[PDB]
């Protein structure tokens, strides 16, 4: 099977979160044949060399999956769009681009943060071509590590609208796929459509906010799967 997570946004002020990632990564990931993650992993980046050491920590837990024989992939989210070949090469993962099609065991599945289908939110789509603009990046990361973290706090206090139905038509019939998977709405849920004349699929994963989730596909079906963060230990009414 291959799993797909996004929208764990960790952070140092939700140690809850990363706890109940770093089980994910020992148990359950290092089963999988790949493990993907959509995008927003962390709730901020300003670069690879934030000393930060979370950072470090995730990087070490997703190695030991890598080293596991587990192939770690990573497309980027809004939130940590500044995630480099640094952080790559510490955590063993590889970087892919905003969009990807994967053969899953016969099925053609495009994958993606899923915020270019928010095609309506024009506000949000102007932010999104200035970050992604190469020397806009080159400028910010040249910057001293304080004053990102400056930058960074006030801009998030600064800174989710739904995916446009037509702009998930177009992607799918780009790609010529009758499955999607991405996260950024924050939405769970398996949304049937139309595309390329036949029936299709667009399957959304949920952010770690309470509880965690993944997309499970296996050579069979195709499985949205929430589960806690922490192992609930049971314990033990009237008649
Ligand atoms: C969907 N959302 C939005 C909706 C509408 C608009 C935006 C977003 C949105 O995604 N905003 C957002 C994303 C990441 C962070 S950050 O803390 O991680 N960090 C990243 C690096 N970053 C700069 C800064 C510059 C420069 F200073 F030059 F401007 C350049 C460059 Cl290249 N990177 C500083 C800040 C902070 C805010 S939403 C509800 O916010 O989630
Ligand atoms: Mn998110
Ligand atoms: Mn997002």
């Not at 837990?61 to 992939?73: E, F, L, M, S």
């Not at 640094?86 to 993606?112: K, N």
């Not at 949205?224 to 192992?231: D, Q, R, T, Y």
């Amino acid at each position: 099977a291959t799993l797909f997570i996004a929208d764990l946004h960790l952070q140092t002020e939700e140690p809850a979160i990363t706890a109940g990632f770093l089980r994910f990564l020992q148990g359950e990931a290092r089963q999988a044949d790949a493990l993907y993650i959509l995008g927003d992993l962390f709730e901020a980046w300003i670069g690879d060399d934030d000393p930060n050491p979370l950072h470090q920590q995730i990087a070490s837990a997703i190695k030991a999956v890598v080293d596991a024989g587990v192939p770690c992939y990573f497309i980027h989210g809004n939130r940590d769009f500044l995630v480099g070949q640094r952080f790559a090469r510490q955590s063993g993962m590889i970087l892919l681009a905003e969009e990807e099609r994967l053969d899953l065991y016969g099925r053609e599945v495009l994958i993606m943060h899923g915020d270019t289908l928010c095609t309506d939110d024009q506000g949000y789509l102007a932010f999104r071509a200035k970050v992604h603009t190469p020397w806009i990046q080159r400028l910010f990361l040249a910057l001293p590590l304080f004053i990102r973290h400056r930058i960074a706090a006030r801009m998030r206090a600064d800174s989710i609208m739904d995916v446009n139905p037509q702009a998930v038509v177009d992607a799918m019939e780009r790609h010529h796929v009758q499955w999607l998977i991405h996260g950024h709405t924050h939405r769970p849920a398996v949304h049937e459509l139309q595309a390329n004349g036949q029936p299709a699929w667009r399957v959304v994963l949920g952010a770690w906010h309470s509880e965690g989730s993944m997309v499970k596909v296996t050579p069979d079906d195709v499985e949205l799967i929430h589960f806690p963060f922490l192992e609930e230990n049971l314990y033990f009414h009237h008649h």
